[PDB]
Amino acid sequence: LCCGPKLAACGIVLSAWGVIMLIMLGIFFNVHSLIEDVPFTEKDFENGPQNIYNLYEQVSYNCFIAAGLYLLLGGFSFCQVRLN
Amino acid sequence: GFFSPGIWMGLLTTLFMLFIFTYGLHMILSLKTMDRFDDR
Amino acid sequence: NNPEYSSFFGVMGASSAMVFSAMGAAYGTAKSGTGIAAMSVMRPELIMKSIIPVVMAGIIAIYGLVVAVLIANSLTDGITLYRSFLQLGAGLSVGLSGLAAGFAIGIVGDAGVRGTAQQPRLFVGMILILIFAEVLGLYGLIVALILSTK
Amino acid sequence: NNPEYSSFFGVMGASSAMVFSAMGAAYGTAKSGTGIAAMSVMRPELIMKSIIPVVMAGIIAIYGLVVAVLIANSLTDGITLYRSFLQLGAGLSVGLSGLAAGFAIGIVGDAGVRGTAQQPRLFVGMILILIFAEVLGLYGLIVALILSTK
Amino acid sequence: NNPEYSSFFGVMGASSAMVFSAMGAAYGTAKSGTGIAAMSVMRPELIMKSIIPVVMAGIIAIYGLVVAVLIANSLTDGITLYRSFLQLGAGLSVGLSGLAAGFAIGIVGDAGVRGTAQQPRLFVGMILILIFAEVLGLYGLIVALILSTK
Amino acid sequence: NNPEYSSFFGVMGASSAMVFSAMGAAYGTAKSGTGIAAMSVMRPELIMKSIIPVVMAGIIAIYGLVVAVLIANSLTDGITLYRSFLQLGAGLSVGLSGLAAGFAIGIVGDAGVRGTAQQPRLFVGMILILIFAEVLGLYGLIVALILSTK
Amino acid sequence: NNPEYSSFFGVMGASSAMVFSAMGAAYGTAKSGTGIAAMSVMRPELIMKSIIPVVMAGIIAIYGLVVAVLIANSLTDGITLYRSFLQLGAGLSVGLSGLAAGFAIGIVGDAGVRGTAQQPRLFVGMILILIFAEVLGLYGLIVALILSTK
Amino acid sequence: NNPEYSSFFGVMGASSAMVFSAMGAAYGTAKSGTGIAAMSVMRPELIMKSIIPVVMAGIIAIYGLVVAVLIANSLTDGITLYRSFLQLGAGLSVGLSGLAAGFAIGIVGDAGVRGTAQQPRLFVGMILILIFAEVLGLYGLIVALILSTK
Amino acid sequence: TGLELLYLGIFVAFWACMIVVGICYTIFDLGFRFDVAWFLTETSPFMWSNLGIGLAISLSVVGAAWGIYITGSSIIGGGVKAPRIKTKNLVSIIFCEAVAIYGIIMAIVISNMAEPFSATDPKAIGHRNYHAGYSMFGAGLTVGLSNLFCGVCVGIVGSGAALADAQNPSLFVKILIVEIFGSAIGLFGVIVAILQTSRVKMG
Amino acid sequence: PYNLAYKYNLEYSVVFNLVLWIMTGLALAVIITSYNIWNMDPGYDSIIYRMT
Amino acid sequence: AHSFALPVIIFTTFWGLIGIAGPWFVPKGPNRGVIITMLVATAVCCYLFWLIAILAQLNPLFGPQLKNETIWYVRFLW
Amino acid sequence: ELFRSEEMTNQTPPTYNKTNKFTHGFQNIVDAYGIGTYREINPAPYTVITFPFLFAVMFGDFGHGILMTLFAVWMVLRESRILSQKNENEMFSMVFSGRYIILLMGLFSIYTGLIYNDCFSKSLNIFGSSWSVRPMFTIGNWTEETLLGSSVLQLNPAIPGVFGGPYPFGIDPIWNIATNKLTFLNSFKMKMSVILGIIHMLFGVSLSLFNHIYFKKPLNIYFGFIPEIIFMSSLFGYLVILIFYKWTAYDAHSSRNAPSLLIHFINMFLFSYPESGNAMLYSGQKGIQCFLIVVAMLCVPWMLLFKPLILRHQYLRKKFDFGDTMVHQAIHTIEYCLGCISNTASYLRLWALSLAHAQLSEVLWTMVIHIGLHVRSLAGGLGLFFIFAAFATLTVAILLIMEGLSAFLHALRLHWVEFQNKFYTGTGFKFLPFSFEHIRE
Questions:
Q1: Taking a contact as any Cβ pair under 8 Å apart, which residues of chain F between 44 and 103 contact chain E?
Q2: According to DSSP H, which parts of L15-116 are helical?
Q3: Transmembrane residues, as ranges (chain B)?
């Protein structure tokens, strides 16, 4: 499908921005395992630093997963611009 | 105090009658007659 | 032994008399001046006679000044309240009555002055009507003088 | 020894005198200026003379300034309460009376200059009628001075 | 010793002074800008000079700013009550007086600019009239300043 | 020793600062957009440089946002009331003052953009006039900033 | 330790936020739909672009939904009153501000939709004015979010 | 224990929900019916499609019914007051929000029918707009239900 | 707009005074002198109940009657050229009569619950009587206003139906569907009013 | 003195209620009556068209 | 922990050389006046902006308010 | 040596300013307000930096500065392709024409965003944040405070003996996670805005000296510039000094009853010197406060009346509309003095816009992208995909465009209203030589 190259081009730029930001976010989560300090902790919070490290790794994985979707989207939109 | 049970309740019932009267009179005032008659 | 702030009503009276009287005379003056300004363009020779409604209008303001001062001369701290209500009533009586007279003067002045240029015979009838409005205003003064001295 | 808030009444007086007088003068000024702008099209030579209604309106504003200052200087913290009430009466008396004059000034000024431009002979009549409005305003000043000093 | 709420009246003054002054200047500005835009199509030349009504309006806004700051700076928690009422009066006096001036500024500016486009001789007369409105606003400032320090 | 309800006055200030400022910006935006849309029919090339009234309307809303944040951050439970009245005055002062500015920005913007369509030379003049309207909002912010720190 | 009826103020916030936001979105929606129905007859190809003001309006409604729910989730019986006033302020701030935003969306959409049909180049300008209105709605949300967690 | 009068507010809620929702539905219905009759004179073939706006209005009526019934069944004498306020809020939230939605339904459906009579391609567009109004009513229901069960 | 200006001026002054007085009571830290519970509790439940009953019947008549004139004039006018109108379009007035009935049935069921109290000091007296009293007021108000706006709706729609039918006899049947929705609006108010007083007692 | 009351009018609620609503009704009657005369319509005919 | 003196040395040298030495090493083409103007204006505005930001943070009167869970996290993080 | 219009060959010549591919856009945003007087000081050479700087202050956002920079880079990289095509869309043409202006806007926005240390409401922690040592917080008589902490925050004390030291560059990252950033950071931006605005105002006045000398108008410097610059310096520069003074003069040790800069500034003008209630910044301040105000007032006669008076003298000595000259000079004096007060406040635009942006960024982040995160692995990733796209959409729609747009105009207005009006005065004509303009057509 063509869908319009003007709209595919927008997706390509948004996808590139998304991968850049999401990968960097996942890195920050792994390094400071932090400023954002929103890993969705439990209310029954104990003195267990390992618990927040585990949450941060999970969030980092999620960021890379979302980036993968933008990587796939960028490929699709790219080929649309080429054929358009 | 400024108001008693008696005075206050009296005011409330008075208002209901004023609201109805105002509506009725309003419609009565907004009544016109004809400028001219159609024909002989 | 008198109630607190009992003079308040009489004080408002003296002011109210002057304020409403000025309002009345002002209304009559504004309407008369409007009709005169429009009238005299066609017949400037009537610009002199046409002033009478305005000079009459001013009597209302004088009425108000007379009562407002008459009351003021009798304002003290130790007022028995009763005397204060009397002063308030006299102030309102002349003020609001003068206001009614002021409206009367203005409306008849406009129509009278305009008509007079159209019909010179109207002059006498205009004066009579104006006289009736002035008499109506005086009635207010009369009551205020009787009441404020009771 | 007297009630708290006793000074508030006097404060309202000083403010009322200034505000209402400015309202009156402003109204007369706005209406006069509106007509004057039009007058310049017919007779530019009247642009100077036609200012007078505005000056007279300015007097209404001064009337108010004088009383407001007299009250403010007369008002103290340990006020006798009676005097505070008189100050409020004086403030309203001059302010609202000047306000009424202001309307007469404005309405007569506009109508007067409009007639004058079409007929310059109306100039004298215009001035006189405005004089009566100024006199009505002065009456307010007179009473206010009587009350504020009693 | 004074009521803990006594400071309420003063701060209401500081707010009222600024708000009413802004209302006045805003009215005069809006009315002037409307007339100016129409005038500018008739002739470019006067667009720059036509700002004057708006500048005067701006002064009214400042008048209000100055008093509001003076009140805010003088307002304390341990207020004397007497001073608080004076601050409320000063705030209302300058704000409401400037508000009245704003109407004169606006109405006169609109009529003046539109007239001046047709008759350049009106230009000076327009300024003179606007000067009276600014003077009326300043009168309010004078009384407010007296009340603030009194 | 902290008076109950003291926090009510306080929070109402923060809200008023935002609500009235948004109302002002909304009015100016609505009027500016209407004029721009009509203008664009004949002179579409002017659309981009006609947004200015709308941006300025926005900053009025921000001025309100700024004070609302300052108060909201200042709100506590044990408020000494005095502080609360300062917050209430600050909120009302900036909100209502910006509201007045919103009308001037809107009304002037409409007339300016429509005029510009025919007289591109009006652009500097439109800007000069609008600046004064923005100043009205600024003055409101200045007072609010002084009160919140007093 | 807590006073009675303390939840009264808070619960009004949750309701007010939703109701005023619905009023704003409904107004903008109704005005936009009128313009859309009238415009689309002549320019049917724009039917899918003139819908945008309606979406804008729905955003104002969400703004309100979010705060009202957040208050409801934080609405309890044992409220410290302080918290209750904060919830009311947050509710009013976003609701009334969104109401102002909805007004602008309404007017701008109505004029913008018709203006666009007569001028396709206006579309981008219309959107930007709409984006400014969305920013105006956000400002209220921002303050409410600050207050609701304070 | 359970204070007296506490059920009063909950009763007002149940009434408010139904009454305000009926207001919205009644207006939207009358507006749609008017437009439908106006169309069918010109062309009957579109009548069935033009009915949806009327159902849209009726939904507003249901929105009110769901909460009014939920509260009315929940109402007792021994109410802990907190619950009564929740009921009051729920009633107002859904009723007033549904009212706003019903208004939009009326305006948009009426204009949509006239537009569709001229342009059958409008069918989808106006229905989409009506969807936003229905969502506005739903938002009301959502908040009201959350509060009533809180 | 002389009357509308008067109505507005009173409206604004009415609430403006309430704002000043309310805020002053707060500012001067009055001892809860403005006591809503006092107002609600001293006011006899008999007043609240009978007000709602009168409203339920009276407002419903106002609605029906409103619609009656809306469609009456349109029907009579159109019929000058289309006398067929009276054959079918009179049902709109039947719809208005049904709207009036809604309120009548509800008003009677409510009034049937009225009883004396022989009560004095509200303290711990008539706890249930106050609930039932307020409920009767609400239910009466609920149905009254609902029928009020119902009757207006069906009137407006019936007018359009008559104007359409005057020009095309095939339109009446399809249009009539809208008036049925209008009637439902009034019925919904009835359902809630029934519920509100479904569990009340006096004595 | 001794935090003593000033005797806040026995039956205050009655005098208060009466005076407020009596003066309110009278004041409104005057305001409306004054308006109606203030805005009296002279007809703006007969001679006015020619003088205008 | 940090001293203030060193940040001043590092960033004053950085922006100083740009605004002081930079103009010394500029082509003689038509843009020479523009390049020097840009170099100096840039260094002065940028240096001042930072200098204010850092000076405003000296001798602080109060510290931040952190959430309890945040405080715990920091205790075992830094 | 300042840039001025070129000579062209007793009539008013046109105003010719030579521009190039880079500076032309900057000249146009100046010309948009008006054409300068012949041989007037051209503000554009300083605008090139001054304007992007003031914008960057309003839009000091690291992340968005990147997006903004990349956009400008795109346009430049496609410059040859954009020129050699048709561009009917005036919105793109405008930003393209200003593409070199935008480039700088982004580059400075990056610089300021880094010091503001905000990239989508996120700070950049370089492991140099030593504001406080939490381990020492517990040492300072905080034993198991995290138990009570369950319902409280607790503010980190100043001068505990264990905290302190500036952040090397920008604001310490710790404040980005504070609940009271709304006082720490807002205070900076307010005070900074005043400092920067006043300095630019003083610069604008300084430029007028070169112009008055160029045209050999001794009177404009002996009765104008000198009292004008003293007026502004004595009132507004004094304020700026005191702001820096407090920062280095008073520590937390005197935080209670610490001097209030605004109150002393207001009391300065009013000659209000209470015996107590406000601590003084330094001994002898009272004498200084009075002196400066008196001098500023004494500066007014110079600019107010000395020029028209001496011109009248020169008329009678040499042998001049004296009345009209007084009017012109009086208007200049009145507008100058009152404008200085208003203009200084005007630069509060820098604070208002910078504050608003930060507040939108924090809320737009928190209420949008945070929601895309969740403890469920795959569901979190898939949701974050769609949520992020919406987030990026809102960041562009609200911040990159609109707020950049508002800050763009507001920074430009500052040049138009407060800066240029101190020296860039009068009007000229646009220089329109014979040229082969229709090349692309």
A1: 80-82, 85-86, 88-89, 92-93, 96-97, 100-101, 103
A2: 24-31, 44-58, 62-77, 79-83, 90-97, 99-116
A3: 1-21
